[PDB]
Amino acid sequence: HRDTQVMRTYHIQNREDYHKYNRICGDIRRLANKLSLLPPTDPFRRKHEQLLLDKLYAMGVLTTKSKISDLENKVTVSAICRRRLPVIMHRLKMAETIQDAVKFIEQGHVRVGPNLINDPAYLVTRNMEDYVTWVDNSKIKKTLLRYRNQIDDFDFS
Amino acid sequence: QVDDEYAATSGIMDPRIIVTTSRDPSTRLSQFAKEIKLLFPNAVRLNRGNYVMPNLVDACKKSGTTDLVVLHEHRGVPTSLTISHFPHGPTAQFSLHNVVMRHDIINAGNQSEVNPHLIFDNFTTALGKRVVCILKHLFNAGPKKDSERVITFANRGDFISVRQHVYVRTREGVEIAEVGPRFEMRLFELRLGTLENKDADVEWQLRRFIRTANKKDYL
Amino acid sequence: FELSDVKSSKSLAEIYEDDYTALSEELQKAHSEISELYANLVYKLDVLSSVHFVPKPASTETPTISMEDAQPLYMSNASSLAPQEI
Amino acid sequence: PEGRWIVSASLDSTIRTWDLPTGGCIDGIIVDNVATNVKFSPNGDLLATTHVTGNGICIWTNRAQFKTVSTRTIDESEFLNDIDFNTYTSLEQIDKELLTLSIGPRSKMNTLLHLDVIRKRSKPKELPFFLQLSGEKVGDEASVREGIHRRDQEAQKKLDAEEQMNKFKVTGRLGFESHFTKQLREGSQSKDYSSLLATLINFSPAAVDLEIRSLNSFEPFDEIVWFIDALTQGLKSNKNFELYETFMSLLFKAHGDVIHANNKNQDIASALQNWEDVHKKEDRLDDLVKFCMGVAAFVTTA
Amino acid sequence: RVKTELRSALKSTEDDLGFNVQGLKFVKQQWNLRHNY
Amino acid sequence: KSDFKFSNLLGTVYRQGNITFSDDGKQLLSPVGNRVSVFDLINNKSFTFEYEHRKNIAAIDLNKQGTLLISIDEDGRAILVNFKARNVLHHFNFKEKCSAVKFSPDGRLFALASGRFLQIWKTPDVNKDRQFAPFVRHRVHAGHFQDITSLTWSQDSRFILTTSKDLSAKIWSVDSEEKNLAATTFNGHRDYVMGAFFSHDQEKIYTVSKDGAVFVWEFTKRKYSWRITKKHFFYANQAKVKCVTFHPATRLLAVGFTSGEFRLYDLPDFTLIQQLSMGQNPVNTVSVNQTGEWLAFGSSKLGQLLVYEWQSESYILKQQGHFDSTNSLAYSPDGSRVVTASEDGKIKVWDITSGFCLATFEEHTSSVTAVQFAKRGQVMFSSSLDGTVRAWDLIRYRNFRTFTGTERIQFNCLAVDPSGEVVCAGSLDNFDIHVWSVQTGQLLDALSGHEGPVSCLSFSQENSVLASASWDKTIRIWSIFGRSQQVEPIEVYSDVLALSMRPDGKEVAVSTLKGQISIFNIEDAKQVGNIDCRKDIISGRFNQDRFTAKNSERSKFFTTIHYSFDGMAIVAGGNNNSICLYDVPNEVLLKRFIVSRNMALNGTLEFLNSMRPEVRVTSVQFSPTANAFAAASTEGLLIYSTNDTILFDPFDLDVDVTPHSTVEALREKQFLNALVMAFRLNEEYLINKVYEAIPIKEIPLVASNIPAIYLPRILKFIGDFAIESQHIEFNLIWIKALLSASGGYINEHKYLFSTAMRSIQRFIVRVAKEVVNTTTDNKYTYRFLVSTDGSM
RNA sequence: GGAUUUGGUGGAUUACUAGC
Numbered sequence A: 001h002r003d004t005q006v007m008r009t010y011h012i013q014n015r016e017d018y019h020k021y022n023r024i025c026g027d028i029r030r031l032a033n034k035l036s037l038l039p040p041t042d043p044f045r046r047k048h049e050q051l052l053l054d055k056l057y058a059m060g061v062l063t064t065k066s067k068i069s070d071l072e073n074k075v076t077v078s079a080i081c082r083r084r085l086p087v088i089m090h091r092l093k094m095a096e097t098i099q100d101a102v103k104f105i106e107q108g109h110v111r112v113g114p115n116l117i118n119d120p121a122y123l124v125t126r127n128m129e130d131y132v133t134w135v136d137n138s139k140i141k142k143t144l145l146r147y148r149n150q151i152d153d154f155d156f157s
Numbered sequence B: 001q002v003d004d005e006y007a008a009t010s011g012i013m014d015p016r017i018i019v020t021t022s023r024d025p026s027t028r029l030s031q032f033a034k035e036i037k038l039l040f041p042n043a044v045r046l047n048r049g050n051y052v053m054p055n056l057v058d059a060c061k062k063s064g065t066t067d068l069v070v071l072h073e074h075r076g077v078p079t080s081l082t083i084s085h086f087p088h089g090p091t092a093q094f095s096l097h098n099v100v101m102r103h104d105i106i107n108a109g110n111q112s113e114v115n116p117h118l119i120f121d122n123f124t125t126a127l128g129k130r131v132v133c134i135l136k137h138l139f140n141a142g143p144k145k146d147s148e149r150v151i152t153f154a155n156r157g158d159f160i161s162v163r164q165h166v167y168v169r170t171r172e173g174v175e176i177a178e179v180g181p182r183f184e185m186r187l188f189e190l191r192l193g194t195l196e197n198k199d200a201d202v203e204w205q206l207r208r209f210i211r212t213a214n215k216k217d218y219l
Numbered sequence C: 001f002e003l004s005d006v007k008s009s010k011s012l013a014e015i016y017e018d019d020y021t022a023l024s025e026e027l028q029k030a031h032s033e034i035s036e037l038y039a040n041l042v043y044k045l046d047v048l049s050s051v052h053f054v055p056k057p058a059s060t061e062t063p064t065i066s067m068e069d070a071q072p073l074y075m076s077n078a079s080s081l082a083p084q085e086i
Numbered sequence D: 001p002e003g004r005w006i007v008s009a010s011l012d013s014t015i016r017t018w019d020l021p022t023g024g025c026i027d028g029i030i031v032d033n034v035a036t037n038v039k040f041s042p043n044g045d046l047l048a049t050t051h052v053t054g055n056g057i058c059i060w061t062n063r064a065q066f067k068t069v070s071t072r073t074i075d076e077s078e079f080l081n082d083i084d085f086n087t088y089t090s091l092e093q094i095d096k097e098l099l100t101l102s103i104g105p106r107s108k109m110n111t112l113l114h115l116d117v118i119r120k121r122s123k124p125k126e127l128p129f130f131l132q133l134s135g136e137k138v139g140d141e142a143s144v145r146e147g148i149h150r151r152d153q154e155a156q157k158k159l160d161a162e163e164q165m166n167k168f169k170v171t172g173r174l175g176f177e178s179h180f181t182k183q184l185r186e187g188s189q190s191k192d193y194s195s196l197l198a199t200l201i202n203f204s205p206a207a208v209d210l211e212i213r214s215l216n217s218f219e220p221f222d223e224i225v226w227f228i229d230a231l232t233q234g235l236k237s238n239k240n241f242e243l244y245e246t247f248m249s250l251l252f253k254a255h256g257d258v259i260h261a262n263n264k265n266q267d268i269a270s271a272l273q274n275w276e277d278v279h280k281k282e283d284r285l286d287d288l289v290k291f292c293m294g295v296a297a298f299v300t301t302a
Numbered sequence E: 001r002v003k004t005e006l007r008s009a010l011k012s013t014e015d016d017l018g019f020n021v022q023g024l025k026f027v028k029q030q031w032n033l034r035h036n037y
Numbered sequence F: 001k002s003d004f005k006f007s008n009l010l011g012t013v014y015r016q017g018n019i020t021f022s023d024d025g026k027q028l029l030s031p032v033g034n035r036v037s038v039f040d041l042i043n044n045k046s047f048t049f050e051y052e053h054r055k056n057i058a059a060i061d062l063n064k065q066g067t068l069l070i071s072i073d074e075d076g077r078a079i080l081v082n083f084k085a086r087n088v089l090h091h092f093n094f095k096e097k098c099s100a101v102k103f104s105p106d107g108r109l110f111a112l113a114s115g116r117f118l119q120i121w122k123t124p125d126v127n128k129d130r131q132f133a134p135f136v137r138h139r140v141h142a143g144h145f146q147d148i149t150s151l152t153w154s155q156d157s158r159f160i161l162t163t164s165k166d167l168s169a170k171i172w173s174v175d176s177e178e179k180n181l182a183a184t185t186f187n188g189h190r191d192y193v194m195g196a197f198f199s200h201d202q203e204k205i206y207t208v209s210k211d212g213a214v215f216v217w218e219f220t221k222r223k224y225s226w227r228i229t230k231k232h233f234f235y236a237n238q239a240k241v242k243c244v245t246f247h248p249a250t251r252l253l254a255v256g257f258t259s260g261e262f263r264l265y266d267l268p269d270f271t272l273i274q275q276l277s278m279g280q281n282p283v284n285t286v287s288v289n290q291t292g293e294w295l296a297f298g299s300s301k302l303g304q305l306l307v308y309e310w311q312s313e314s315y316i317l318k319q320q321g322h323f324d325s326t327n328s329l330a331y332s333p334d335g336s337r338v339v340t341a342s343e344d345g346k347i348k349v350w351d352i353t354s355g356f357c358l359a360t361f362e363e364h365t366s367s368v369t370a371v372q373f374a375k376r377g378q379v380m381f382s383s384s385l386d387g388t389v390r391a392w393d394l395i396r397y398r399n400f401r402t403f404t405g406t407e408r409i410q411f412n413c414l415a416v417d418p419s420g421e422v423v424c425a426g427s428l429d430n431f432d433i434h435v436w437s438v439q440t441g442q443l444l445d446a447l448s449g450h451e452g453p454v455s456c457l458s459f460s461q462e463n464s465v466l467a468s469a470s471w472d473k474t475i476r477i478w479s480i481f482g483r484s485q486q487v488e489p490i491e492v493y494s495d496v497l498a499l500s501m502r503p504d505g506k507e508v509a510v511s512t513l514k515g516q517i518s519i520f521n522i523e524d525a526k527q528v529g530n531i532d533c534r535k536d537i538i539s540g541r542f543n544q545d546r547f548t549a550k551n552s553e554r555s556k557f558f559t560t561i562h563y564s565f566d567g568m569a570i571v572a573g574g575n576n577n578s579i580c581l582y583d584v585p586n587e588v589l590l591k592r593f594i595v596s597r598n599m600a601l602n603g604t605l606e607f608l609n610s611m612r613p614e615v616r617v618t619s620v621q622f623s624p625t626a627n628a629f630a631a632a633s634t635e636g637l638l639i640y641s642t643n644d645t646i647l648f649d650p651f652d653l654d655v656d657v658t659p660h661s662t663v664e665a666l667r668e669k670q671f672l673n674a675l676v677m678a679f680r681l682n683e684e685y686l687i688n689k690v691y692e693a694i695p696i697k698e699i700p701l702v703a704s705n706i707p708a709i710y711l712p713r714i715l716k717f718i719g720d721f722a723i724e725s726q727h728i729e730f731n732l733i734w735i736k737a738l739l740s741a742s743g744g745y746i747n748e749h750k751y752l753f754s755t756a757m758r759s760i761q762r763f764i765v766r767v768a769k770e771v772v773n774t775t776t777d778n779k780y781t782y783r784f785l786v787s788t789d790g791s792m
Numbered sequence G: 001g002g003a004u005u006u007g008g009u010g011g012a013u014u015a016c017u018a019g020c
Helices: A002-010 A017-034 A043-058 A085-091 A098-107 A141-147 B029-039 B053-061 B126-138 C012-020 C025-049 D107-113 D115-122 D141-145 D150-167 D179-190 D194-201 D205-212 D223-235 D241-254 D256-261 D268-279 D286-301 E003-031 F659-668 F671-681 F684-691 F696-705 F711-721 F728-741 F743-748 F755-787
Strands: A110-112 A132-134 B017-020 B043-046 B067-074 B077-085 B091-095 B117-120 B149-154 B161-169 B174-182 B186-191 B202-205 D005-009 D014-019 D024-030 D035-040 D046-051 D058-061 F005-010 F027-031 F036-040 F045-048 F057-062 F069-073 F078-081 F088-090 F098-103 F109-114 F117-122 F139-141 F148-153 F160-164 F169-172 F196-198 F204-207 F213-218 F227-233 F241-247 F252-257 F261-266 F272-277 F285-288 F295-299 F304-308 F317-320 F329-331 F337-340 F347-351 F357-361 F368-373 F379-384 F388-393 F399-404 F413-416 F422-426 F433-437 F443-447 F454-460 F465-470 F474-478 F488-491 F496-501 F507-512 F517-521 F527-531 F561-563 F569-573 F578-583 F620-622 F629-632 F637-641
Touching (some): A017 A043, B029 B174, B053 B067, B117 B126, B126 B202, D005 D035, D107 D115, D107 D205, D107 D241, D179 D223, D194 D241, D223 D241, D223 D268, D241 F755, D256 E003, D256 F755, D286 F743, D286 F755, E003 F755, F027 F057, F117 F160, F148 F196, F252 F295, F329 F629, F337 F368, F388 F422, F454 F496, F465 F496, F474 F507, F507 F561, F561 F620, F569 F620, F671 F684, F684 F711, F728 F743
Parallel strands (some): B017 B043, B017 B067, B117 B149, F057 F098, F413 F454
Antiparallel strands (some): B067 B077, B077 B091, B149 B161, B161 B174, B186 B202, D005 D014, D014 D024, F005 F637, F027 F036, F036 F045, F069 F078, F098 F109, F117 F139, F160 F169, F196 F204, F204 F213, F241 F252, F252 F261, F285 F295, F304 F317, F347 F357, F413 F422, F422 F433, F433 F443, F474 F488, F496 F507, F629 F637
């Protein structure tokens, strides 16, 4: 029951979410394997996984882009399941717990740039990880500003 | 091997540095910041007054500079000097004792301002290699093989002594002459943060009050 | 190149025929599998990252006709090259 | 809805329809029950009236949305079709001096121009019982040291054409002389091609390349000299100035090899001098465009 | 006297170009059906 | 100026449904998901009906007369539009899913097949006035094991045969008396029968199957009825026939396969003329014209429509629409050239005059975000998310240089120096404005100073100043030329995702996230005014939503803005359902345009009845010609326009001025008055009555007489008329006279006349010079032949 | 006479051609 055991730690909608990642996280390694079977001094192969580690680090599933061994060993579903939006709202200390962040996404208090986001299971790029905020004029961004005694209703915060 | 803070930029991008002064400077040291502005290339002099060290650091990481040179003084004689690498890089508070400003001497002219060669002498310690790699990156990379001014950083007796020289090469010997400042210089503390931070981790710190303080070198 | 101890399935007459008759026939089929898998990865990865619905890029012998023709088409090929370059 | 009408209802038990450009009624409706209110739709479709007796609202369907409406002051009778149906078709040509274009699309010059390059870019892209091997190819280096299929491919290439001909064996008989060459032949005999050039407008651009390439060219050169005299008689009429010069230029791609080698024949150059005596007059737009360009560049920029 | 001469001079060097353009295309084209497979 | 109409939809040539040629065959109509587009091959022009269709078109019916055109949606709604009228005569509702609707050759009634039921309905007369209940159904046939997959009509209306998907095929006569002639249903066909065809002789019946085996039915003695005379088989390794179209007079068979290979056969000889693969994806619907010269094959998967002629190997029109949507819209100085970006990254250049793509660009592997044109026809710069920017030529169709950054950053948006020296681009990753030179592909400088990413970048042509867009709520105006390097910053209330630069070069129009559009000055930091856009934005409730459409914050801002070239109006468009036209001085919107009414798309309905692609406009620009502004949608690039001019917009009417009075002036020979009396109505047919009337000898006298106030208006009229009109020589004498009469005045008021100059000098470049060059080239060739010595 | 809250039905919520 590894699929359930990580559905709890990150709070997932459907128990099938895990194996929806673990099909991708396996598909990384199958492309890693056949790209390991090409000869090492091939300017395709040298170009092609560094082309891929650019993307898998921008998305942020893997910690570094130097170690080439991470691509088979550290690519786990729990790695890709913590660039989920409610985990990121718990990493950035927005909500208190990780269930409570799903409660705030589903009610509609969080946003990415212009548009608010409503699927809890929004993957967030490490580049896009800068831009999550509380949605403006919300009743939960109004309460935060009352704690510091710094509301400003010309913003109608 | 270069330091881990300077590793990404090392040879690729030129540095851009800022020489700025303490607070309401005396007119002697406000000259003397201009000799620091001339001793490096890519150096601009921004007079400081009613800036805070946060909003002069934080409005410099934003605009993007490699590091920051701030000076201090006692009664016109400049005493201290810090270089602080900006993208969360280290800082090095230097004490500098024997100064001779360039504006004292004669109206001999003006400096060469071309990319200098360097001379680092008597740096053996691993902390001595830190001071190498934190001073060296204040100059624009790759000087020409026949550029004519060379800046020596000499370390006899734990006081890093820096002089500015021009040289020409005669039929037999090199003949040199001095322009620019004479320093003695001494680092006394080395933070891993910038000079803003004031609670960053202290890599090195000149201990004065120790039974073997006068014994060792680079201590 | 490393010699393989395992017996060659191809016979001596067959190996000569290959010599008698892209980069490599095995390596290109490795490259073709691995780009079909990556475009599948970008779709699912792209859908989670994107805030808007995105259609699948791809769904993976006789004459082949390009649906869209690149460049002017009516204009001659010679015209595109500059005079200086000939 | 477009300000073109006013419909007013009055205590004379009428409902009129005023026309704001021409300033008069164009329709007068005598309703026995007097109409209190008349309101158009904001859309151009419905007209609603409310009368004095009765309870409901009479809704009128607008024929003007499905049909043009005459603008005559007909009301006094009961109680320039350019202007009446308020549309104007253009002239075909103002005067005999003015050059014109062809009626229709402006792509007909462009498609009729580069017809060979477009088709070259439109098409799609696409043993023996005893093996034969050279001494050098096999392990005979010594034989190679003292050693001392294009035609077959060409023969194979003849086979596809033979196969297509064999494939189609239609017994249908199609007139020996095509309509084009027959209309060229009657045009030349008549000495007036005005009916000929009316056919050359109505060909497809696909037909024209198949047509002008299909011109009987021989020592006497009768068809080519007949065809040039069509184009010179075209530009004397000044109609369709775009197309007839492209019919001229399409000769020189298809038969410019031929009329060059048979230059200074007195029969062809009789036509070509009759071309150049006609073609000189139509420099007067090339001297007109440059003034129209160079001023308008000078005016808007500077 | 400035404008008409400058027109007549450039046109005289604009005539020399296109008279050499149409000829050398015709030299290129006539080889291109004599000796082209 | 104010009343725009939906003139044209551009891009997405084929989406779904039957593609049917006109009886004449001059115009071919391809059905889009929510609309029907008619293409005229002879005139190379594309026309789209103003009517919305509430879901995607599933079937298209064209009357032989052409008076009535019927489109059937998935829901079963029936829309009848007269081609000449271009209006919806009636909108009857069918109650089941429709597969194909074909009108009878006589046209008295139209056969309609839904599910396993066949229906014949009398068609209401187009000439007859509209009625409350026009639809009437003649008969219903329910004798089918499964719903018919295809419907075929004989020349006579007596026999109608529909091929069922069960395997069985049935024949139905129109009139009840001819039932005894033919009521039999064919059997023994393998797989499914894609379609049933009838030859000119009614003795032979041709049927096709999914397997690819073809069987011909011939009536003969074993008192004797309907044997299989001969079977014909098509061999495909994996290909299966999907859609089959057969023409009886030319005996030509069009076969559609899953593989996408295109093949042609003749029923009498069973000989394959040609096999061609239009695309890897299988053909969905194939149609043939009466002549049979043009065959249209469209693949839904690739969304591309292709037309081919069997007799001659030439394609009348072949094009493929963008796979997803157009990220950016680029307008060239010439009105006709249009450039549209796509999510795929393929770049295709559309034509304003005819809705076809001249060429495609596949240089950008990554999606293209912004496409802009410098002040020349020489090149266009495209911004992509790949991290590289590549300039393109339009004379040669090639990259000059592919500008890239240092550390390989995405590029959203782009700004090009009008004097084409400098190309600036902006990111989401870096928030540093990179600056490339056009000659040297190095980056000159990394202009920085923003917190948060750069949304957009633009350069004012008059002052050559570039203004950055930031998510930090501060607008910073850069000045990058010539020893200054000074940046001026203006604070904004909310993230600014929209930046617009006025032609003047003195004002900047912004679109913040609070909805509100602000208009700043540049030489001062202050603002002129702001206009409030949160209320007049229509927002859709999606299907998967949990909030009301009133209080979602998805779409109430504007992700684009473009000033008109007059400098007096802004068109804005975002991820919403609506486009706007704000007036700039009076600060009030003029008219609000709903982009689409589709239940198929998500963002349409404010209220649902008691994921799917979102419907939003990406980038909007106003054309130089200025008749209409193109907004790049989800459905494809829209074009709005005013080329109708069915509108009475008078100017300075007296009581004395009537249309008849202007005609009287021509008799009076008062050309100066009858032109001004026709300009007062501002109606085009009076103007063409007096413009074409007055002769050459009094054109310049009239030009001098024409007032300064009407000079901008008269120039605009000449610009729109002379493009499609045969008079080159008469129109150019007007443009010689207007320019000759007041050369200094037009030059002095450069800002006042912008649209008129651009429109007039598209007419000169596109059609006037090409007539000159053909006259020039022909004259030189004749000179060469006489001058050159004779051969041999 | 006035105010608040609530149960239930009917009519709309796409554009009106009759049931088996």
